[PDB]
Design a protein around this nucleic acid. Structure first.
Ligand SMILES: [Zn+2]
Lengths: 201, 59, 52, 112, 123, 144, 333, 88, 60, 172, 25, 53, 105, 93
RNA sequence: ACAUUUAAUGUGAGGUUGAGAUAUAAUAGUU
RNA sequence: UGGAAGCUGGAAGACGGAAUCGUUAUUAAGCGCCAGGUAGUCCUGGACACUGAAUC
RNA sequence: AAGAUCAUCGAAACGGUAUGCUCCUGAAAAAAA
RNA sequence: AAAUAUGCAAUCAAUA
RNA sequence: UUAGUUCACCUAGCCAACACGAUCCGGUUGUUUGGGAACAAUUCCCUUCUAGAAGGGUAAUCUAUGUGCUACAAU
RNA sequence: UGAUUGGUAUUGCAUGCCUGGUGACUUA
């Protein structure tokens, strides 16, 4: 273990030396702007087309062709479609079309049901308990007391996973948001929409 | 061992089929409780008990 | 800090570089230092280094 | 060895205050870079999947999840690290023997 | 039963059936049918990326390794993944995905020449 | 099934992922607890020494600060012959979450300070045998 | 620690302060009992909250405010516990630790001593109802003019009554128009002309009780999300790319991110913002399709892939090349 | 042999064909389930006619074998198996 | 009075060597434990009382 | 397979360069940085240009080259296996050249021959005219570019309990 | 990996419902 | 978030102990609690209702 | 439909100042460029394409004029105005070095 | 002398967040400079996160103690752009 | 579900500080 | 020369010389299964169960 | 789950090193007989 | 016999 | 809440887990771009065809050791 | 989403902590 040889920089080396240090990981911490993202994507595509290709690329392209043929892609027809930018999102539509009670004395469901949610309590803690934001509603189709067509529509819409045949029970879950109140509101809205769709039967 | 863990006593014990010995150290109240337990609260045949080398006021 | 202060008081530090660095780092008590975390990262390179 | 000149019994280092480790500092830098650039990589992958091309993403080589390693929190070693502890063998041993795990259900009287 | 291909429970994770008749097949057969029935799918939809897969409509071309390997690349190994995909994380039946693709493509059932149906599993 | 409750934990221990077993970790809490222990042990006695250094102007400073803040200063000093005892306290450093649990002991706190006690007969981080908690002896070692 | 110089720090003063704190805790418990008997909630607290009657809300708010006003400020504790059980138990524990513990066994049995007190057992079942018992139920029902906090509910009702009285002096129509229930939901905020978007603020405690950010408060997006029935991505559902394929892709991404856990709302917003611009400044999707399809035909022929040499041949054959324009030690020596 | 494990106590007591047997078994394998069923059948037979348990005592039908699998040891491939130790 | 419902005991392990270097055949196990116990109240009318008791029962 | 790199592009080869130079040159003029704006290094050395004449090849090699090059997609980079015939067909010409490089990285960027240098010298004024035109366009360039961001429409001023206090602001 | 484990995976596929040969070809 | 929760929290952001701040906290923690806006508005509304009975 | 129209108006008014999510894509080579050379924009006997365009920055907010030489369409060397001026200044030395190396050859 | 008493935000008797943001407790002159600079620019520092506050503090310290060439950000990003983004995100009340 | 469009978009042209020494004008006019 | 699969298989190999190792019955021996290394990767390490003896 | 029970074809019909096309992971396991 | 069409583990009836 | 806190030697092992002495640099430290061995070799060659989205053969070298995995047993 | 006071340089023949191998651990 000895000292590394010292090299006296030449005048040429000092004159042709970078005036700024190279980009570090500490600098990379700053996110890439969308302009750089797009430029990198364009450069990679151009290089790959230019000839830095691979067999995996061909296989991936064939798989994408199969997906497009089965129609599970975002490609646009040249004649059917080619020959809006602002839209109402599905959750906003659900909220807007939802009907809410005027007062706690008014019920907008009219059928038996049970609402379940989980809450966590304990000594002081710095980390929030995971898996405590979902809520669900359970009810019996017989209690709902619908016609045969409406019951079949309900079962088909909810699928076999949400239907327990042993006791004729059906459950609907909502764990789409990390907040229990938001999950409960979404659950109520979707339950109302489900009942409307069942009545459409 | 359970009694000593509860009472925060220290030292050592040694139990066998017919005898037992030990050297116990700790607070005066804890020592008195241990003495009472050994004299009256042992679930085995205790024909004789003896205490010796008692010292107090240790730093 | 305590170890270096003891060794410096007993004059057990030989290297002048070590003496200077340890004196600059440990002589002034944290409460008296104008900036407690006077430096971070490498010892001889100051914290906001754009090169390290 | 039966040391010929035994030294004093040294007090162990603090549990929560590890010594400087530039490798750990760079690991933290990589972790934060991945946290910041996670969305951009998702955008890259979305664009490539929509275009149906299996192209590389070089910037992930530097700001990706796979540049991060599980390093000992108390020792700085980058091997033999479990998520349930985040510490290496000696860090875990010191923590257990200092009595910080009795509250958290650790049972030293259990072998298996 | 020693090596019967159903397990004890007669699992059919790759089987697909048509609800209009008793016809049923598996995912590889479904992929082959999709590649063979491009003309019907294209007509219903209605040098070009749309028709790039037409050459694969020939039985002989598919029989040839030139087409058989393309068939096997398109139909991969859904029941083979990573080694960590075990226990509770074992692969599940992609029959639902295959049925959805078939229904959206409106491929015709070989035995009844219908348009929809094609539920999962075997009837 | 001869020993059911003996093997009760085997299923979770061996044949379940941690993320799906439901076992609750301890790292994210002990990490803050150890630093709390060190900070308290380092700062409490010095705080008490600083408080007791003068020991004569404590009440005067309290009176002046009460005048500055509340404007009355008669809550602690109704008359000249009333003594207001000062209890040493330290800043709270561990980000405990405020919870609706009415029995939580650190949710109704509003001052950002906690009382500190130098007396504790039972040592909390009980080591095994002769081992000493790290960071306890700052005096440099002496060799033979 | 210097010897005692002023009697303020003497032990008897400390014992007196502890006794005074315990006395104040007992006074507070007595006051709480008197308030409970003076302003009882008929039918139970939960039933009163669910019914939402003006008298019940008024009585609950009055009782809560009186308790808040009467709650003392102790000397030996810096935690102003609103629960008389907690206050009394902490005072008893402090006194026991100060002048009742002989040894470690006593310091450990302090908690059993506290739990064996009958009065504490009685007070154990008299704490306030946490909001989450009913707030999720109200949200599921769909009540937006609600508040689990009794004082807040009373304030809302009283403000509504004041506004109605302002008009009470074609008049019933105007009064109903001024009534809160008859206000359109679209008009609550100009930027969200859709109904059922704003809910009732939860009364659950928030923030960090003790840290470097003890009084930081809610974040910019947290303040907004605490006032909605549930979040929606309508903020970014505009000015989508003119290209049809990219517009469809971004719309699908927005729809999927609306129903997706593991993604923060800020993360979704930023992702959409970046993706929109990326697609906008990228080339046409159909042009990319044509170019890629021409570059990668269905069948892979020979010679269509870049040739790659062995790693050992490229690198591991000794020192053969160094890239440096200005080096004092070139490979020639 | 598994069938005999299950149905021997009926023969030993002489009640072969007198009784119809209904069994619910879970866990283990063929031989383990056979042993559990043998023990259960013996217990049921002694409950039906306690005085006839002498016929089962000698055969040891009413014995509950609590032996469990030997745990694998650290540093060993199995409970007792190990790598081949190489000298030098 | 609720209906008691005992729940099993869970465990977890982390395995480490006994030595700071070499000696892979010397190993140590760190075992953790959890316990769960469920109590069910039915047709609860005194919601406030039941919740207060349940939350104030928690110890340690 | 362990303890190795991750880049196969290094094993592969990049774009074929019009002018070939031994980089770093054995003999070259002192390197001077062109400017500090982008850290460009400039030097002068000797380069060579190679050209292949398909006519001066055997029939089999020529037909194979045509087959590989005239396909829909060029095969094998449009070359032939190296050999004496291909080497003889290829003709090399030597000429002085001017080369650029990136500082620190020292990656070769371009190589310009004397003909190119003289031609750009003669065409310098057109470069300035084009720069002036681009600078003039820069106005509308920036004007259009400043509105390229997709902005989220967020609640700028949301009051407390809007549902319960819709009193202050309201239309009709 | 091990031939036995490969055969085990093939047997798992067969149980799941995919007829694949067990020959180690 | 999960990957950015590995190491210890910063040890240079721990609050310092200052006598002035201790006295300020001691003075402030005894601050009075005013009557609630809900009750004040309730009184005002009662007066208005009595006036306009 | 009415709700969507109101939302469109509100969003446009809110986002006028900051960003409207426009696109300034022009392909490669950019259509706003300025040619350098003959009708094919080729300079020199080696037929090297050259065009001047306002290069974009990493943030996509500010642009700078730049002369780009391309081997066909792929850009190999790009020079800003300052770099071009510096090269013009240094050319006489470049000429001397090239003459010396030609004499060497 | 002595530090100015903190202003409780609402329903509190203290606030360590304000002291930390102003760099009074823990005392940190670089953080005090960061607070003053952001206040002068027009950024509501109290509304910022810990990460952003520390980033701005580090950037300002580096710029002050190494030169105006530093700090240097990739992708042609600038400290002025960062400051503008922070001002837009947290308008000063 | 009732659902085009905030302003530009010119050459065949898609690669916006070049992913880089090492024989083939190969590729995005010809060579 | 990451792992898995398929078509073909002109790779050794017929229980292995001097010598040499593991093993105390739910054990040897055989068989499968799975947590963890925070993408993929072992026949390693650590476990789990099923069949299950012989020998002084 | 396998080694099962039962019941067929059956002896180098063993063995599976080797071999470019195919599949899985990942930004990256490329070329190749 | 107008009952069934039958292989077994390493968690759960204090709940399948 | 259940830890052999046990003793002696092999100057046995670990300063590359960590701490702490001696002694050495503070560049004997950090940062950026890459590499970090054995599976050669020659777009491997040749033939046909408008082009293959075709067809055929050739292919050395690998010192020794320990441990695992997989294999060879009928006539 | 809370980073830091250099060295994986020598010295295990200076040591602490921790391990391997061999020995022991008998009382009334
Ligand atoms: Zn059919």
């Amino acid at each position: 273990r000895g000292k590394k040889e010292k090299v006296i920089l030449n005048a040429e080396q000092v004159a042709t030396k970078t005036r700024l240090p190279p980009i570090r990981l500490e600098d990379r911490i700053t996110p890439e702007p969308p302009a750089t993202v797009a430029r990198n994507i364009r450069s990679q595509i151009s290089r790959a087309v230019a000839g830095w290709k691979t067999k995996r690329m061909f296989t991936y392209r064939n798989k994408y062709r199969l997906r497009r043929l089965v129609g599970m892609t975002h490609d646009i027809d040249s004649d059917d479609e080619f020959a809006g930018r602002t839209f109402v999102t599905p959750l906003t539509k659900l909220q807007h079309q939802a009907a809410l009670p005027r007062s706690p004395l008014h019920a907008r469901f009219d059928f038996p049901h049970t609402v379940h949610y989980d809450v966590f309590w304990g000594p002081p803690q710095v980390e929030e308990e995971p898996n405590k934001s979902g809520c669900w509603v359970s009810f019996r189709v017989a209690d709902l007391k619908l016609s045969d067509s409406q019951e079949q529509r309900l079962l088909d819409i909810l699928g076999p996973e949400r239907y327990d045949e042993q006791t004729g029970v059906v459950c609907l879950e909502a764990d789409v948001f990390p907040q229990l109140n938001h999950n409960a509101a979404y659950l109520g809205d979707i339950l109302q929409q489900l009942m409307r769709e069942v009545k459409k039967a | 061992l359970q009694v000593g863990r509860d009472l925060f006593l220290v030292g050592w014990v040694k139990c066998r089929s017919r005898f037992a010995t030990g050297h116990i150290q700790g607070d005066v109240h804890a020592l008195s409780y241990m003495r009472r337990y050994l004299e009256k609260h042992v679930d085995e045949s205790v024909s004789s008990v003896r205490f010796y080398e008692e010292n107090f006021g240790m730093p | 800090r305590l170890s270096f202060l003891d060794r410096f008081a007993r004059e057990r530090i030989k290297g002048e570089k070590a003496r200077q660095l340890g004196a600059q780092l440990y002589v002034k008590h944290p409460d008296q230092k104008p900036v407690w975390p006077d430096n971070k990262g490498l010892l001889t390179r100051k914290w906001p280094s754009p090169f390290h | 060895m039966a040391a010929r000149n035994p030294g004093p019994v040294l007090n162990p280092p603090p549990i929560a205050f590890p010594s400087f480790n530039r490798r750990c500092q760079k690991d933290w830098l990589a972790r934060r870079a991945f946290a910041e650039n996670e969305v951009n990589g998702r955008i890259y992958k979305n664009v490539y999947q929509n275009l149906g091309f299996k192209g590389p993403i070089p910037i992930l080589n530097k700001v990706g999840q796979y540049r991060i390693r599980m390093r000992c929190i108390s020792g700085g070693y980058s091997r033999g690290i479990f998520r349930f502890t985040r510490m290496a063998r000696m860090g875990m041993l010191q923590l257990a023997r200092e009595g910080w795990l009795k509250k958290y259900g650790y049972r030293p009287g259990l072998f298996r | 039963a020693a090596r019967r291909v159903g397990g004890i429970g007669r699992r059919c994770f790759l089987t697909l059936h048509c609800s209009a008749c008793s016809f049923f097949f598996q995912t590889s057969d479904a992929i082959k049918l999709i590649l063979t029935q491009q003309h019907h799918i294209l007509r219903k939809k209605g040098a070009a990326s749309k028709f790039s897969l037409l050459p694969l409509a020939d039985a002989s071309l598919l029989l040839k390794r030139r087409g058989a390997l393309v068939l096997r690349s398109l139909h991969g190994d859904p029941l083979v993944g990573s080694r960590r995909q075990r226990g509770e994380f074992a692969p599940q039946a992609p029959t639902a995905e295959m049925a959805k693709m078939l229904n959206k493509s409106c491929v015709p059932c070989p035995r009844c020449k219908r348009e929809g149906r094609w539920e999962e599993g075997k009837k | 099934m001869a020993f059911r409750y003996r093997r009760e934990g085997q299923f979770t221990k061996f044949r379940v992922h941690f993320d799906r077993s439901g076992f609750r970790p301890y790292i994210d809490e002990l990490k803050w607890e150890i630093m709390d222990w060190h900070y308290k042990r380092a700062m409490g006695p010095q705080m008490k020494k600083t408080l007791m250094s003068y020991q004569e102007g404590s009440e005067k400073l309290q009176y002046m600060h009460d005048l500055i803040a509340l404007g009355t200063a008669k809550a602690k000093f109704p008359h000249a012959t009333k003594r207001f005892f000062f209890v040493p306290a330290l800043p709270v450093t561990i980000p405990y979450r405020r919870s609706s649990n009415p029995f939580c002991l650190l949710s109704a706190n509003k001052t950002g300070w906690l009382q500190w006690s130098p007396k504790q007969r039972v040592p909390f981080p009980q080591p095994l045998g002769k081992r000493k908690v790290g960071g306890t002896d700052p005096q440099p070692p002496v060799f033979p | 620690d210097h010897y005692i110089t002023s009697a303020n720090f003497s032990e008897p003063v400390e014992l007196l302060s502890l006794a005074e704190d315990l006395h104040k805790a007992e006074i507070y418990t007595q006051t709480t009992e008197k308030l409970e008997k003076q302003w009882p909630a008929a039918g139970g607290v939960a039933k009163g909250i669910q019914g939402d009657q003006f008298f019940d809300v008024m009585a609950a708010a009055v009782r809560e405010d009186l308790q808040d006003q009467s709650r003392p400020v102790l000397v030996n504790e810096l935690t102003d516990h609103e629960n008389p059980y907690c206050m009394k138990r902490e005072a008893l524990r402090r006194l026991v630790l100060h002048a009742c513990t002989r040894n470690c066994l006593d310091e450990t049995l302090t908690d059993t001593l506290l739990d064996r007190r009958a009065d504490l057992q009685r007070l154990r079942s008299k704490a306030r109802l946490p909001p989450e018992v009913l707030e999720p139920l109200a949200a599921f029902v769909g009540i937006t003019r609600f508040s689990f906090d009794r004082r807040a509910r009373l304030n809302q009702k009283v403000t509504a009554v004041q506004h109605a009285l302002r008009q009470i002096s074609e008049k019933v129509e105007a009064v109903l128009s001024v009534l809160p229930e008859n206000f359109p939901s679209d008009a609550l905020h100009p930027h969200h002309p859709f109904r059922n978007h704003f809910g009732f603020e939860s009364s659950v405690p928030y923030g960090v009780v003790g840290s470097i950010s003890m009084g930081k408060g809610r974040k910019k997006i947290e303040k907004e999300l605490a006032r909605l029935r549930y979040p929606t991505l309508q903020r970014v559902a505009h000015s989508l790319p003119k290209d049809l394929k990219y517009r469809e892709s971004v719309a699908h991404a927005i729809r999927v991110l609306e129903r997706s856990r593991g993604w923060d709302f800020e993360s979704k917003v930023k992702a959409i913002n970046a993706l929109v611009e990326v697609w906008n400044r990228l080339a046409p999707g159909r042009t990319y399709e044509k170019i890629l399809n021409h570059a990668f035909p269905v069948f892979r022929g020979r010679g269509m892939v870049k040739k790659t040499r062995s790693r050992a041949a490229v690198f591991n054959k000794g020192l053969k090349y160094i890239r440096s324009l200005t080096t004092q030690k070139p490979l020639h020596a | 042999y598994n069938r005999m494990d299950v149905l021997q106590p009926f023969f030993l007591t002489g009640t072969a064909g007198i009784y119809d047997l209904f069994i619910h078994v879970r866990g283990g394998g063929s031989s383990g389930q056979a042993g559990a069923v043998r023990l259960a059948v013996g217990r049921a037979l002694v409950s039906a006619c306690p005085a006839c348990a002498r016929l089962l005592e000698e055969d040891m039908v009413l014995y509950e074998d609590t032996r469990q699998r030997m745990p694998k040891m650290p540093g060993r491939m199995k409970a007792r198996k190990m790598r081949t130790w190489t000298k030098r | 009075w609720p209906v008691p419902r005992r729940i099993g005991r869970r465990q977890w392990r982390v395995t480490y060597l006994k030595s700071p270097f070499k000696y892979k055949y010397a190993l140590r196990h760190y075992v953790f434990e959890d316990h769960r116990y469920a109590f069910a109240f039915y047709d609860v009318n005194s919601v406030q009382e039941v919740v207060s008791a349940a939350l104030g029962a928690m110890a340690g | 397979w362990r303890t190795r790199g991750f880049r196969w592009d290094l094993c592969q080869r990049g774009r074929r360069r019009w002018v070939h130079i031994n980089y770093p040159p054995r003999n070259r003029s002192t390197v001077q940085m062109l400017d500090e704006s982008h850290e460009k290094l400039v030097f002068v050395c000797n380069g060579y240009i190679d050209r292949l004449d398909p006519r001066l090849l055997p029939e089999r090699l020529r037909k194979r080259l045509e087959r590989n090059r005239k396909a829909a997609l060029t095969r094998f980079d449009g070359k032939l296996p190296w050999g004496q015939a291909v080497e003889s067909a290829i003709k090399r010409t030597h000429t002085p050249c001017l080369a650029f490089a990136q500082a620190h990285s020292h990656h070769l960027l371009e190589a310009f021959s004397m003909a190119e240098v003289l031609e750009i010298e003669k065409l310098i004024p057109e470069i300035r005219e084009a720069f002036k035109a681009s600078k003039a366009k820069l106005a509308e360039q920036e004007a259009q570019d400043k509105f390229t961001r997709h902005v989220s429409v967020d609640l700028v001023d949301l009051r407390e309990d809007p549902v319960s206090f819709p009193f202050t602001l309201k239309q009709r | 990996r091990n031939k036995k484990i490969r055969m085990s995976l093939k047997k798992r596929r067969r149980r799941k419902g995919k007829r694949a040969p067990c020959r180690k070809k | 978030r999960q990957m950015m929760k590995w190491y210890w929290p910063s040890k240079y952001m721990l609050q310092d102990v200052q006598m002035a701040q201790y006295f300020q906290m001691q003075a402030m923690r005894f601050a009075p609690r005013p009557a609630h806006v809900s009750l004040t508005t309730l009184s005002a509304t009662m007066e208005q209702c009595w006036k306009k009975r | 439909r009415t709700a969507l129209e109101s939302f469109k108006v509100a969003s446009k008014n809110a986002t006028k100042t900051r960003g409207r999510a426009w696109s300034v894509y022009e392909g490669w080579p950019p259509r706003s460029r300025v040619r350098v050379g003959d009708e094919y924009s080729k300079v020199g006997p080696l037929q090297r394409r050259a065009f001047v365009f306002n290069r974009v920055d990493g943030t996509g907010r500010r642009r700078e004029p730049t002369l780009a030489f391309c081997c066909g369409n792929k850009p190999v060397l790009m020079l800003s105005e300052a770099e071009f001026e510096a090269l013009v200044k240094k050319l006489p030395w470049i000429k001397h070095e090239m003459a010396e190396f030609k004499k060497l050859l | 002398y002595g530090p100015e008493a903190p202003q409780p935000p609402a329903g509190l008797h203290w606030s360590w967040w304000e002291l930390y943001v102003k760099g009074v407790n823990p005392e940190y002159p670089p953080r005090q400079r960061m607070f003053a600079f952001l206040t002068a620019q027009g950024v509501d520092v109290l509304e910022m996160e810990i990460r952003e506050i520390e980033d701005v503090t580090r950037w300002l310290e580096m710029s002050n103690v190494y030169g105006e060439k530093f700090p240097r950000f990739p992708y042609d990003v600038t400290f002025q752009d960062k400051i503008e983004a922070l001002k837009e995100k947290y308008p000063l009340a």
